[PDB]
Write a protein that binds this ligand. Sequence first.
Ligand SMILES: *[C@@H]1O[C@H](CO)[C@@H](O[C@@H]2O[C@H](CO)[C@@H](O)[C@H](O)[C@H]2NC(C)=O)[C@H](O)[C@H]1NC(C)=O
Ligand SMILES: *[C@@H]1O[C@H](CO)[C@@H](O[C@@H]2O[C@H](CO)[C@@H](O)[C@H](O)[C@H]2NC(C)=O)[C@H](O)[C@H]1NC(C)=O
Ligand SMILES: OC[C@H]1O[C@@H](O)[C@@H](O)[C@@H](O)[C@@H]1O
Ligand SMILES: [Cu+2]
Ligand SMILES: [Cu+2]
Ligand SMILES: [Cu+2]
Length: 495
Amino acid sequence: AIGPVADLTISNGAVSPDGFSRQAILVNDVFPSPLITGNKGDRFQLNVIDNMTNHTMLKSTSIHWHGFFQHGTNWADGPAFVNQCPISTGHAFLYDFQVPDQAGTFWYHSHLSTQYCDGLRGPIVVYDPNDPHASLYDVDDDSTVITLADWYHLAAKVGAPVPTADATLINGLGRSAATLAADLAVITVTKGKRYRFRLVSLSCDPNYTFSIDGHSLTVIEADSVNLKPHTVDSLQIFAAQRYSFVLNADQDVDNYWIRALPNSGTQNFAGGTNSAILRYGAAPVEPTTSQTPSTNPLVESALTTLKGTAAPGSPTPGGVDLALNMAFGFAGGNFTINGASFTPPTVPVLLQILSGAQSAADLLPAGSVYSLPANADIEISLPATAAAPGFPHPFHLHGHVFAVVRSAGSSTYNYANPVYRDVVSTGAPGDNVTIRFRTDNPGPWFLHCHIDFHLEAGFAVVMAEDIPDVAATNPVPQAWSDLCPTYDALSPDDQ
Ligand SMILES: *[C@@H]1O[C@H](CO)[C@@H](O[C@@H]2O[C@H](CO)[C@@H](O)[C@H](O)[C@H]2NC(C)=O)[C@H](O)[C@H]1NC(C)=O
Ligand SMILES: *[C@@H]1O[C@H](CO)[C@@H](O[C@@H]2O[C@H](CO)[C@@H](O)[C@H](O)[C@H]2NC(C)=O)[C@H](O)[C@H]1NC(C)=O
Ligand SMILES: OC[C@H]1O[C@@H](O)[C@@H](O)[C@@H](O)[C@@H]1O
Ligand SMILES: [Cu+2]
Ligand SMILES: [Cu+2]
Ligand SMILES: [Cu+2]
């Protein structure tokens, strides 16, 4: 509804998405954060005005525009102390980037510590006027965006270091155990019409098993990548993933439960928990529909891209320029990858590079940075392990889409027409989720666990892609160059 040129004013205030009042983060004076829209190829100019006054939730901020490649604008990507120093309170900062060659469903969120769980997270849609799937539906608009989120009665820094959610919010509304009368979200449809629903996980932690009673879902886009249509009766969506699906409103006029079962916390629907309403003329009451067993669940390995794009490289293990293996571990309240835990360096990784760092051994933090050759194919395997609790861990690679040559719960490799996405579950112990991508994008890019409570615990690495070309490819605006001095002048209590 706003965008692609717009102000985003960040402030604190009370919210009660589940009928419980708590302090949170507001964006343009609303919770949940508003939807931003634009079209394929557009210039986005989003002026993030930081007016937050609460240090427990951090007065500083940084926004990541999730899914966008940010080619030439690595400075605008969002990660605190990788791509910028945070915006300090009482200051504004403009993210000015372009979206060539990308269309689909995205989201924005704070990429500073675990701040996005406190409410700074909203959907984004980039419309394609020549969408390959335009003819599959009649309605695609603001009312067809569906967001899922985890919600906590105690703030990120206040509750447990890995808290259990009190509520699942669908379009920013849901019920908790003790607010079973709280307003549910209503998604309205007219019989005979076909809907492009755009489902985005704003989750800080849980994955949801998503279904709609009595309806099938035709999946046509995954993480901003066009798919071949693939009809399922349920899907597991992980933190930060998006799916577009077509729903044909061809059932009896009625109310139907929209369901989102989290993999932890309250794992049922008693009293309308973890649920929203699909309303056809139907009575303005709750659904009384029954969940039938899922007989045709989404399987990631059975998805493919619309074009049938092959994976980069030659169809064999290690058949690439550089293959890397990320071994997960956990020691001392810290997650590790190849023995190293991520602690945000004081000089942002991009700034280190611009300032003359030439290699990964130069780059801080030590052991957390990987140099990547220019214009190459890369293969990364992320084998799951019990040695890193709270699996399955979804990983996200910034500045890039990747081929999922191997998925969780699959034994097979697919080099010929694998799905392409940007957030992938690494699965349960025994899996070896494996991805490949092209180094077509000079700059430092976070690769990390998108469960945010684990990202605090350092479950992250940085891909330092084409170091020699980072400065030339990524000219930075003077406002970017003023972020660090301004942030370093702040006292800890104002951070
Ligand atoms: C700033 O935000 C924090 C974190 O949300 C608020 O923390 C609350 O602290 C009170 C009083 O100590 C507790 O009873 C609440 O349970 C906390 N809320 C949450 C969500 O954890 C704090 O109130 C905020 N500061 C101001 C001035 O509003
Ligand atoms: C997960 O997959 C990776 C990549 O195939 C495996 O790493 C390779 O292991 C073989 C045999 O030990 C070696 O030839 C290579 O050096 C490894 N490739 C690297 C490091 O890039 C890894 O062992 C697999 N893990 C599990 C648990 O199956
Ligand atoms: O920090 C949480 C605190 O919040 C207060 O409002 C009360 O609910 C206390 O029981 C609790 O200790
Ligand atoms: Cu993200
Ligand atoms: Cu994790
Ligand atoms: Cu990230």
